[PDB]
Each structure stands twice: as C-alpha cells, then as structure tokens.
Amino acid sequence: KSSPYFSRYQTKYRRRREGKTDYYARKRLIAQAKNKYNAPKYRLVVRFSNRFVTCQIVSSRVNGDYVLAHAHSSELPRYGIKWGLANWTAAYATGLLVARRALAKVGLADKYEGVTEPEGEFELTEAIEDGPRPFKVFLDVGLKRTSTGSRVFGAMKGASDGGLFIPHSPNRFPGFDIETEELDDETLRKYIYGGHVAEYMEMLIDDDEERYQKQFSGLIADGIESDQLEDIYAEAYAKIREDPSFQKSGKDAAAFKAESLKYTQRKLTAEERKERFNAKVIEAGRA
Amino acid sequence: KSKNHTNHNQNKKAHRNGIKRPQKHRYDSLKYRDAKFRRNQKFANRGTVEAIRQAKASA
Amino acid sequence: KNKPYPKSRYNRAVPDSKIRIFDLGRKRAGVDEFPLCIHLVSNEYEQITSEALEAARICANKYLVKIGGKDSFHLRVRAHPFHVVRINKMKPNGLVARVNIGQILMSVRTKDSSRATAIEALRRCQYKFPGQQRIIVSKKWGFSQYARDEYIEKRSRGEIIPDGCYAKFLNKRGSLQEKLDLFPEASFNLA
Amino acid sequence: PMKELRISKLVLNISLGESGDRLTRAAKVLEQLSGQTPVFSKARYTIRRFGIRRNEKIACHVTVRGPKAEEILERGLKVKEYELKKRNFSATGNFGFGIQEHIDLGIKYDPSIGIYGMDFYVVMDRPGMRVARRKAQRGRVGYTHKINAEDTINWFKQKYDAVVLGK
Amino acid sequence: PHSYGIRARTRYTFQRGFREHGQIRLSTYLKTYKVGDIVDIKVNGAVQKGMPHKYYHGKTGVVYNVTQSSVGVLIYKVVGNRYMEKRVNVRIEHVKHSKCRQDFLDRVKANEAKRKEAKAQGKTVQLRRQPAPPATAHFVSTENNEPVTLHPVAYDTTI
RNA sequence: UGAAAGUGAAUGCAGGUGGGAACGCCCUUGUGGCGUGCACCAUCGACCGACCCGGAAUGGAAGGGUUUGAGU
RNA sequence: AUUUCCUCAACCUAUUCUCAAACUUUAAAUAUGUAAGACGCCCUUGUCGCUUAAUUGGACGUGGGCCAUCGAAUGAGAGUU
RNA sequence: GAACAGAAAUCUCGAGUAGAAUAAAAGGGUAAAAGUCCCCUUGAUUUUGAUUUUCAGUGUGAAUACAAACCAUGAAAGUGUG
RNA sequence: GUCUACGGCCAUACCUAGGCGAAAACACCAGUUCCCGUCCGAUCACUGCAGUUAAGCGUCUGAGGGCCUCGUUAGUACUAUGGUUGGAGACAACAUGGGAAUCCGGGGUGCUGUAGGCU
RNA sequence: AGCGCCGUGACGCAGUGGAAGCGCGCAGGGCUCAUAACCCUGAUGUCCUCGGAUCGAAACCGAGCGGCGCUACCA
C-alpha cells in the first residue's frame, strides 16, 4: 500500500468493481456477426433481489444498453400473484409478462402464441410454416450459478411459453434427475404452478407449528394450500395474457420534488474550505 | 570477403521508374469475398438483369 | 563513443571497482554549519577512470586532513564508474565514469574562513584528472538546493528544521495536524 | 444493534501429530467427534527430512458449525481448564487453542484406543460478512465493523466465563 | 543473425498501454463496418487470433470483405518499384474507424448546405479551402501597454 | 479436356456491367448533353472436359458445387 | 532466569550522491500510413436461394432532382505490353 | 494466530495489479482468466477456394479469416479446423 | 427533485480515517421440506417479513496517498537543414525551423438513457 | 602472455552449506628399567587473507599473493 503501488495500480471497470457485470460473458452475449451489420442481439436479463424478480429484454448499442420491454415481479399483485413475489411462479409470470410486452411491441402478439395452458413440457417456440420467424432472445443470468433449478431457467421457461423463442435445453429444469437424461413433466408442472410451496405447506402444517407460523407469514393471514395456489396462478396467467400492457401511474414529482433535496449533504466551496482551515489553525493555537 | 549486402543504390533504382501504383478497376473479383455472399449476389444480379430486361421490353 | 556497457545479467564477469568510499570527513555535519560550498565541475565531456577518481580522492583527503583538521570537511565524490571498457587480451578490462557538461566531480562544504584552502584542494587535485576542469564557488548553502539569503530568511520564520546532515523543509502539502506537530516554530499565517 | 459476536466456524486440525498409517483411524476419530466427513487434507511439497508422502492425505480438518459448535468448544475448553494465553488471540479476531493428551475429552479408551489430540481454531464474525463472501456484488467490511483482539477477549469473558492468561 | 519470425522486433509494438491492460472495451465489438469504409489497423496484444503482421500496424486501408468476427482490409505496400495489393483479414479488435472520413463527411455536408443556401438566395458559392493567408494590417495600441525596453543579460552562474 | 476408358463447347443480339475508337443527333460555345458502341482491360454469368456430390446387370439424362483446364 | 544494556546483523520510514543496448511512467525533431467528391450528394423504386422477429439489413441496381471555387497549394501528358 | 517445537508441517483470518503460473529460450498477452481444480469430449476430423510472413509475391515451413459436412461442449449467446 | 431496475467511457470513478442518509429499493437477516452442491445450507437454491441501519451502498469532511487538468520549469533539453564557422580533438557558437520530459505550484475528486416508486 | 587447479593442525592427505576428519610430530600417566613396539589418552586447523549473496560458509560468489601446470603449430 505504498505510493508507487497506488500510482501503478490499474482499476477494473466500474461494474466489475461493483461486482455486477461479467464482462467475459457479456462480450459473447452481445456480439453480432459483422456480416449481419446492425441486427441487434436481444438479451433476456433476469435478476433476483431478496424479495423481487426483475426480467427485461435489452439490446446493446455503442453508447449504452437499451431496454425493449421490462417486467418486474412487483406488478403481479395487480394480476393476483401477491405474496411470495420471488417464487418460481413469480419468475414464470414476469417472464411471461415481459414476453407478451415484447411481442406486442414488435407486433407478434396476436400471431405468435406460446403455451396458454402450461403443462410442464419442454417446448421450443416453433416457427410458422409460412410467416415471420419468432422473436429470438438469449437468456442472461448475470452472476447466478446455473444449477438445475436456479430460477433463471424458470424465468426463461416462462418467457419461452409466452411466445418468445429462447434456445434452451431441459437440462436445468426443476425435475431432471440426470441418470437417463429425461425431463420430469410432473415436477416441471408442479414448480410452474407453485406445487413446491404446496408440498412445503403439507410438511409444515403439523411438524413445528410455530415455525409454520413464523415462516410463510403474510399469506397465512389470507390464503391456504390448495385453495388458490394452482388456481390463482392459472387465472393470473390468463389475466396476463389477456392484458399485459404496462401503465404509468399518477405519482408525479409534486410535493416529493421539494421533499427530497433537503436531505442532501451539500458540498462547500473553496472560500469555505479556506475559512475552515483558518478556523482550525486558530483553534489549534500553535501558529 | 562475400556477404556484401547494402541498400545504397536500391532506393535510386526503385525511383528511377518510380513507385508504380496498381491500376484501379471499377469491379474487383468476387473470389476474395465470402462464399455465401458471392453465391447470393449471383442470384441477386441475375434477377436484377432479368427485371431490367423485362422493363426495357415491356416499356 | 560506444553505448553504455554496465554490469548486468548479460555482462557478469567484470573486474571490481577501485573507489569504495565516496564521502570523506565530517559526513554527519549540520545544515547551519558549513555555510560555503566548493564544486569541481567539468567543462568538457570526459571518460574519467576509476583509477583517476580514487587517486584524486586520496590526494584531496591527504591534503585536507592537515590544513583544517579531520572534522572540518565533507568531501564527496560525485562521479561513479558505471561504464565497462573492454580490451582484447594481449571481455571486460576496467571501469570508467562518463561525465557530461557541467557535471560536478568533487564537492566540499566548509566555512567562509576555509574558502581559500577549499579552492586550493580542488586546484591541486585538478592535475589528477584528464581534460580540463573548473572550480566554482556555489551560490547555494552547502548541499541545500536553496540559496544562502533565501535559507536564512526562511529559517528566521522557522520553516526549516535540521535532521542530521540535511534538513527538512515546509511544503504546501500533507496533513495539517502533522505539519503543526512537526513545525512548532513555524508561524502558519492565515494569509 | 446486531454487532454481537457469535461462533462462525471452528476448524479441528490434527494436533497429536501426523496421520501416517493412522490416517484412517484419525479419520474415524474426527468423524465420531464431529459427525461429518473428515475431508482428508492435502500435501503441498514433500519434506526431504520429515519424510511425508507426496499427494497423500496427511491431515484432516472439520468444522462443527451450528449448536454443536458451542458443545465442542465447551469440551475443548474443559481440558484446556478454561485458560488461554493472550497471544492465543489474533489481531484479526480469531482465537485458537491446541491440546495434547486431552484426558477431559469424551473419547473411548481401552488398551491402545484412548486419548488423542486435535487443535481447535475458532473464527467469529456475525454481521455483514456475506458482503465479502458472496459471489454477487462483493465489498469490503467497514473498519468499525471489524473484530479485534480486545473484542475477542471481552466475548471470551462473557461466554465461557473464565480468565485469559496475560503472559 | 537476423530472425524472420512473425512477431519479431515487436517488443513494444504489441504492448498494451500503461494502466490499460486487462479487459477490452466492448464498443469495438459493437462498431459497424461496411465495404468501402476507411479503417485504421492497430494491433491489440490481448487478442492473438486474427493478428495482422507488424507491417500493417498503424496502416490505413479500405474494407473489402466482411466476415463474422473479422474484416478484410486492402493495403498498398512497397515491394520495390511498385505498390502491391495486400488483403489482410483482421479481427475487429485491431480495427478502428478513421476520423478523417467523418471529417470529410462533415465537410461535404457543410458544402452541400452552403450550396443549397447560395442557390436559394442567389449568392456566390465560395466553398473551396484556402491556405493560411497573409496577415492583414492591425492597429496595435500603446495605451496601458507601454513598451518595455529589453537588454541582453550579463553572464552570471546560478550554481 | 482427363492418367485413361471416354466425353466433347448458343437460355439470350453468341449474354450483362464499367471505361472505351469512330460515327450520328441536340445543345449553344463549356474540360459540352443523348444514342449506339470496334479493339483492349477489369468484372458478373452461360456452355465443354476433369474433380467432388445428391442418386433422382447395363446408361449417366435432368439437379448441383466452396473447385479445376494451356477451353467455347 | 522466555527481565535490562549497546555496538552484531536484519527490517520499516523520511532522505541523499550517481547509472542502464538487451529498464521505464512520459516523450520529441526527422521520417512514415490514409483522405482532399464526378466511381460525388438526397428522394421514389427493383433483384436475391444471403441476413433480419420483420422489405429488416448488406450488395448490386434503376428513375428523378443537386453540373456556377467539380471542392488545399504547386508542377506535370499518362499508362500498359 | 493454534498445538506444535522451529516448521508456519498442516490448519485459519486479513493485506495482497499479479511482484505467481502459463512444458521447454526470450519477448508480448492473460485475474469472476489465457492461471489452479472439476465435468464432458476428441475441431489434433473430411473437403474447396481466399489471404499473411519469409518472397521472385516461385517453392517449403508456419499462420489468418471464411465456405460445404460431421461433431464436441455449454442453458445459451457462442467457442473449437491442436 | 430523491431513489429503484438495467449500460457506455473505464481512478477527476481507486485506497484510507471520521459526520449523516425521511420514504422506498437494495442489503444483512429468519429455517433447510423441495430443486441443487458442499467436510461444513459460510458460498451455494428455496417458503418468508419478526428485526436492523449496523455492515454493504450513497454522500460529505482531510492546505489526505494517488488520479485528472492547467501554468512555471522553458523554448531549457533535444533535434531537421548550412557554412572554406571556432577548436588539435572532444565539443561549442551562430543562421533558417521544430520543440520535450521529471519536478514544483494552482484547480478538481465522475459524466452519461429508458421504465417506474417516495409527504 | 593467456587458461586451469590448489592453498586446511608444527607436517601431510581427504573435506558434499546445518559444520571440521585421519595419520605423523609433541606431551604426559601404565607394563617393564627408559626409550623402540606399545596400552591409556590429551591438546593442537585465522579453513591462504579480505568482502558479499545466504537465517548460517572451508564449500557459493569475487579481489589480492604464492605454488605450479596446459596453449604454446603452416610459411
């Protein structure tokens, strides 16, 4: 930690220092063949917070990234997927929502339907026999490990069933059981409709009582197993497919415009810096 | 003693007839291009010639 | 005229240098002491040998030890042999120092009452070096880069504090608390 | 708030000596003492004097993370007589203690089966160390959010009420 | 004892800049190249595939072929008494656009705009460039700027 | 053309594009606009032989190719 | 006496004198690549089996408008066999 | 820092711009890798043309970007003709 | 206006010690049935809001270490061209042109879109 | 003149980084009368001198002196 060490130190990229962007994977994610010229490569960026799931479709330009369509998991409560906003169905629904929004934006909404009634089947979006090819998006997972059921593939599966063409394999689906290399459709459908939460409910109904009360809070006050989980997930799938449009609310700047700049630590000027230096010298009294 | 390489007169010899530039041609051979690009351009040019000839004949 | 040929991993077997001691006399003097400096500068490009450097150093030291005492001079050799001269056997042979324009060879800091003998020591040792040389009465205060009048003016305020042979000076950077704790006599005027 | 020091990890290396031919027996000793696979260690460079075996399991170290971490620490401190030197406490906030001939440790004993030796090393860091251990956006824990030797002295005074030997 | 290796005498030519190693900026992969573009060849040491020869470093050519990950550049090199055409397949990491082409495009656009305005208003064109013209007469004043008489300084050592 | 057994040169105005001699017509005197366009060069095609294919007992006809010939 | 002493070494800090063809953060002068519209500039359209989610794009084109400093200076007839 | 008993053996926490490693000379390059470990494989495969270096723009050697097939690996974008 | 979700340039962004951060987001965090992977649910994937600003994060304060920029240094060093210039030479001056670096001093301590939330 | 080797108890011959070996000589106590042969032993080496890398040098690397030896051919 010497002065020459600091002088010769070369910092990484800002996002690499922040630990947000894998530039090695990003280069291969956005790199169009030069003979295709200005054809943009679209990435289905999927990110998970502790509570929320964000899925969006991004195209990269020279000056920065451009978002075509977006869908955050803090929108599904308007459809009926309140509570557990980071579950498998939450990722599936927001992937389906962003797929419908992108298809509407590109015009392939009422023509390229995906799987209106999911059944846990590995189905790639086939192209029309005589018509435009399906919208092709490549999944982006960021830094999350690609384990068998990491929920990046769950969001990808939802986006693919929404009508988008996401090239993928069933290797990393919830139930795959890699001995005979066969997908488990029952497990896939169970995870799509939140059956893993239901099995957790069955195991915890009478095994620790207090743990089932303290964990899975919130929804304990409104819902119960087998009453709405598979049902309301299917109904909101239909609701999303019926009306996937996004709207801007009326919460404008208004009073928040003036109720925000007050709590900002402002920077002093050179004159104030000189005054503070002189005041500190006087306070020391050694000059 | 052999191995008497030098470059004293080589520049003068080159500039005696000058540094000639190659002749510039309007069209370059497509053997230097991509195989798929050339194959598609063959059909594209064929259709363009057919369309132009049809326009001249009909009009 | 050859490119510099120092000792390195490509030129390893080189005969040892001849000058080992480069400072003679009261090396641990003070900035306040020795208010006069004499330098032996070179007015032309030379290739001074280590043999000449050590011979002149010995001659200067033996002359200085009996005119003012061993504790009155800080003779320093400012030329170091770094070029290896090769010779075909009758392939390093010797070590020489390359000297540019206005480069100092020997430096002596003494008092104002010893200026005459400080000049005389370098004048006598001029005969041991090839080429021509000059003797300059340095306008700076000893080995300090500052001038005499500037140094005493700053010392009156208290911006200079001695430390062994050299001293430390006030600079317009660093922590204010550390600067205050290290320079008590320095009057930090608010300006 | 949430700046309370608790147990984080406790590695149990082999203090009695080298595994050698007793490597398997030491492995079961760690397995029965911790309840986990002994995860045989690895040799880096062969010693021309100690005569170690290259690329051979010479040591085994486990951790007892959880409620049993306190139990194992209690058992180790019982033979150690709840007395540790001040130098046992590292400046980074971790403390270790090695034992030889633990008579107070509950390991079976008969004609040759009997006392063993495991050196415990405890690392304690409760709050906000995921921000430094996670694959996601990683950061450096704040200076005020750090554990010093004095903090370890105070925590060892509170929990496992005893005296530190100030040598 | 000369050696004719591909990367001979390229100790500093292919070196990355100081405090410029590591990651390569991704805007290079997003640059669009078309046939006929004027590009500059600057070899990047981090990328070894598609590396052009050291001769073509710092050379400006014309794009003639476009592939998936590289581009074809036409260069003219002296091989004696004539120039020879060289077609170099260079990856886009070592290829950048020439800013002279953008400057030429801006000049042409400015010329077209002035020509359109001149046609609309029935005025002169005056579009061609001119070299540095001779200075016109000025009126250098003396008020508050009284001349300072200077003399050569005497010789005084400062050592 | 192929080593050879063998096979053996028009989709078209004996093709398209750019420059191009000569000629003709208009401008309106400009280093002019338009129409063809010999020779030659560059280039995109077509045909013949060889090679590699699909492969639709003896035959290789339509369909082809990133190629090849000192060919039309 | 795992208590103290200084020189014995060693380490750190701030310094200090002097060097590098096979050292370097920087970094000239000279030399050197490219360009200075007529194969130029914009609208309307045609071809494709290539490319794109897509007449989307690339390339080749076509019909109209821009031909008055035709776009730095100087000099010169040039090229192919 | 831990028993050890010189040994940092091994096991740890911090600092750590690469001062390590990358088969072999040197130079260049490389840090969620081009280094270490793990899994799977044989793009170290068949064929055609174009290009670079040494060049006479002959040969040999080496190399580069493509195309027609068959593949490997990945979830995929992609990458792989030692 | 503040903040959240996602990029470019890649330290006027890094490193270090302290003052603050209403709401929201992020984060830590609450357990290992399921998917998954480890000696070890610490990393790794899950059902969750009971808690926290304390860490991360944002911002401000250092006549901070660095980094960026502008001047001094300095037209100094160096260099293209010239002389039947000087000097034994080394080198130097001059003439027609080009023109640094290190240091020191002054200033600064990131800029940048789309879609949405917060008395 | 170059190149190569060596310098170790008073003497000689070995000598590999965790550190000086053996014999001769000297000196005693014991058998016998003392030495010769002995028995018992003991002591004696700045590792040629100097400096440095190494945690530590006789050894590793350098400068000096002494001892030597090898190249020492075609007109």
Coordinates of C-alpha atoms in Angstrom, one line a residue, chain C:
Chain C
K1 CA 31.7 6.6 -28.3
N2 CA 30.2 3.2 -27.5
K3 CA 26.8 2.7 -26.0
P4 CA 26.9 2.3 -22.2
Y5 CA 28.1 -1.1 -21.1
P6 CA 27.3 -1.7 -17.4
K7 CA 27.4 -4.8 -15.4
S8 CA 24.2 -6.9 -15.8
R9 CA 22.9 -10.4 -16.4
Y10 CA 24.5 -10.2 -19.9
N11 CA 27.9 -8.8 -18.7
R12 CA 28.6 -10.6 -15.4
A13 CA 32.4 -11.2 -15.2
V14 CA 33.6 -7.7 -14.6
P15 CA 36.7 -6.6 -12.6
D16 CA 35.9 -4.9 -9.3
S17 CA 35.7 -1.1 -9.0
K18 CA 38.5 0.9 -7.4
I19 CA 36.7 3.6 -5.4
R20 CA 34.9 2.2 -2.4
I21 CA 34.5 5.3 -0.2
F22 CA 32.7 8.4 -1.7
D23 CA 32.4 10.5 1.4
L24 CA 35.4 11.7 3.5
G25 CA 35.5 13.9 6.6
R26 CA 32.7 15.1 8.8
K27 CA 29.8 13.4 7.0
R28 CA 27.4 14.0 9.9
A29 CA 27.6 17.8 9.8
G30 CA 24.7 20.2 10.0
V31 CA 22.9 22.5 7.6
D32 CA 23.6 25.5 9.9
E33 CA 27.3 24.6 9.8
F34 CA 29.4 24.8 6.6
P35 CA 27.8 27.9 5.0
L36 CA 30.1 27.7 2.0
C37 CA 30.4 25.2 -0.9
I38 CA 33.1 24.5 -3.5
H39 CA 32.5 22.3 -6.6
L40 CA 34.9 20.9 -9.1
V41 CA 32.9 21.0 -12.4
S42 CA 33.9 19.6 -15.8
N43 CA 33.7 22.0 -18.8
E44 CA 34.0 19.2 -21.4
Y45 CA 32.9 15.6 -22.0
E46 CA 35.4 13.1 -20.4
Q47 CA 35.6 9.4 -19.7
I48 CA 37.3 9.6 -16.2
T49 CA 38.7 6.3 -15.0
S50 CA 38.2 4.8 -11.5
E51 CA 42.0 5.0 -11.1
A52 CA 42.0 8.8 -11.5
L53 CA 38.9 9.1 -9.3
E54 CA 40.5 7.3 -6.4
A55 CA 43.9 8.9 -6.9
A56 CA 42.3 12.4 -6.7
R57 CA 40.2 11.4 -3.8
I58 CA 43.3 10.2 -1.9
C59 CA 45.2 13.3 -2.8
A60 CA 42.3 15.6 -1.7
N61 CA 41.9 13.8 1.6
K62 CA 45.6 13.7 2.5
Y63 CA 45.8 17.5 1.7
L64 CA 42.6 18.3 3.7
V65 CA 43.5 16.3 6.9
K66 CA 46.4 18.6 7.9
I67 CA 45.1 22.1 7.0
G68 CA 41.9 22.4 9.0
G69 CA 41.5 19.1 10.8
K70 CA 39.7 15.9 10.1
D71 CA 36.4 17.4 11.4
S72 CA 36.2 20.4 9.0
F73 CA 35.4 19.0 5.6
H74 CA 32.8 16.8 3.9
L75 CA 34.5 15.9 0.6
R76 CA 32.2 13.9 -1.6
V77 CA 32.9 12.2 -4.9
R78 CA 30.1 12.9 -7.4
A79 CA 31.3 10.6 -10.2
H80 CA 30.7 6.9 -10.1
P81 CA 32.3 4.4 -12.6
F82 CA 29.4 2.7 -14.4
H83 CA 30.8 2.0 -17.9
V84 CA 32.9 -1.1 -18.6
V85 CA 35.8 -0.7 -21.0
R86 CA 36.8 -3.9 -22.9
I87 CA 40.2 -4.8 -24.2
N88 CA 41.4 -7.7 -26.4
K89 CA 43.8 -10.0 -24.5
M90 CA 47.4 -9.3 -25.1
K91 CA 36.0 -9.2 -22.4
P92 CA 35.8 -6.5 -19.6
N93 CA 39.0 -4.8 -18.6
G94 CA 38.2 -1.8 -16.5
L95 CA 35.6 0.6 -15.2
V96 CA 35.3 4.3 -16.1
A97 CA 32.8 7.1 -15.4
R98 CA 31.2 9.2 -18.2
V99 CA 31.0 12.9 -17.4
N100 CA 28.7 15.4 -19.1
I101 CA 28.8 19.2 -19.4
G102 CA 28.9 21.0 -16.1
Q103 CA 28.9 17.8 -14.0
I104 CA 30.5 18.0 -10.6
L105 CA 33.3 15.6 -9.7
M106 CA 34.3 16.6 -6.2
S107 CA 32.3 18.7 -3.7
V108 CA 33.5 20.3 -0.4
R109 CA 31.4 22.2 2.0
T110 CA 33.3 24.3 4.6
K111 CA 33.0 27.6 6.5
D112 CA 33.7 31.0 5.0
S113 CA 37.1 31.2 6.7
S114 CA 38.2 28.0 4.8
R115 CA 37.2 29.0 1.3
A116 CA 40.8 29.6 0.2
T117 CA 42.0 26.2 1.2
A118 CA 38.9 24.5 -0.1
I119 CA 39.6 26.1 -3.5
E120 CA 43.3 25.1 -3.2
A121 CA 42.5 21.5 -2.5
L122 CA 40.5 21.1 -5.7
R123 CA 43.1 23.1 -7.6
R124 CA 45.8 20.7 -6.5
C125 CA 43.7 17.7 -7.4
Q126 CA 42.8 19.1 -10.8
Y127 CA 46.1 17.7 -12.1
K128 CA 45.0 14.1 -11.4
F129 CA 42.1 14.2 -13.9
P130 CA 42.3 14.1 -17.7
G131 CA 41.0 17.0 -19.6
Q132 CA 40.0 20.5 -18.2
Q133 CA 38.1 21.3 -15.1
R134 CA 36.8 24.4 -13.3
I135 CA 36.3 25.4 -9.7
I136 CA 33.0 27.2 -8.8
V137 CA 32.0 28.9 -5.6
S138 CA 28.5 27.6 -5.2
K139 CA 25.8 30.2 -4.6
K140 CA 23.7 27.6 -2.7
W141 CA 24.0 26.9 1.1
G142 CA 26.2 23.9 1.3
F143 CA 24.4 20.9 -0.2
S144 CA 21.0 22.5 0.2
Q145 CA 19.3 23.5 -3.1
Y146 CA 18.2 26.8 -1.6
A147 CA 20.3 29.9 -1.7
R148 CA 22.0 31.4 1.3
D149 CA 19.8 34.5 1.6
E150 CA 16.7 32.5 1.0
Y151 CA 17.6 29.9 3.5
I152 CA 18.3 32.3 6.3
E153 CA 15.1 34.3 5.5
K154 CA 13.1 31.1 5.8
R155 CA 15.0 30.0 8.9
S156 CA 14.1 33.3 10.6
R157 CA 10.4 32.4 10.2
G158 CA 11.1 28.8 11.2
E159 CA 10.1 26.7 8.1
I160 CA 13.3 24.6 8.2
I161 CA 14.3 22.1 10.8
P162 CA 17.7 20.3 10.7
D163 CA 17.9 16.5 10.6
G164 CA 21.4 15.1 10.6
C165 CA 23.5 16.3 7.6
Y166 CA 20.5 17.6 5.6
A167 CA 17.3 19.2 6.8
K168 CA 13.5 19.0 6.3
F169 CA 11.5 22.0 4.9
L170 CA 8.0 23.2 4.9
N171 CA 6.0 22.2 1.8
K172 CA 2.4 23.1 0.8
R173 CA 1.0 19.6 1.2
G174 CA 0.3 17.0 3.9
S175 CA -1.8 16.7 7.0
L176 CA -2.2 20.0 8.9
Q177 CA -2.0 18.3 12.3
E178 CA 1.2 16.5 11.4
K179 CA 2.7 19.7 9.9
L180 CA 1.8 21.6 13.1
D181 CA 3.2 18.9 15.3
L182 CA 6.4 18.7 13.2
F183 CA 7.0 22.5 12.8
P184 CA 6.3 24.2 16.1
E185 CA 8.3 27.4 15.5
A186 CA 6.8 27.8 12.0
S187 CA 4.2 30.7 12.1
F188 CA 1.3 29.5 9.9
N189 CA 0.0 32.9 8.9
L190 CA -3.6 32.7 7.7
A191 CA -2.8 35.0 4.8

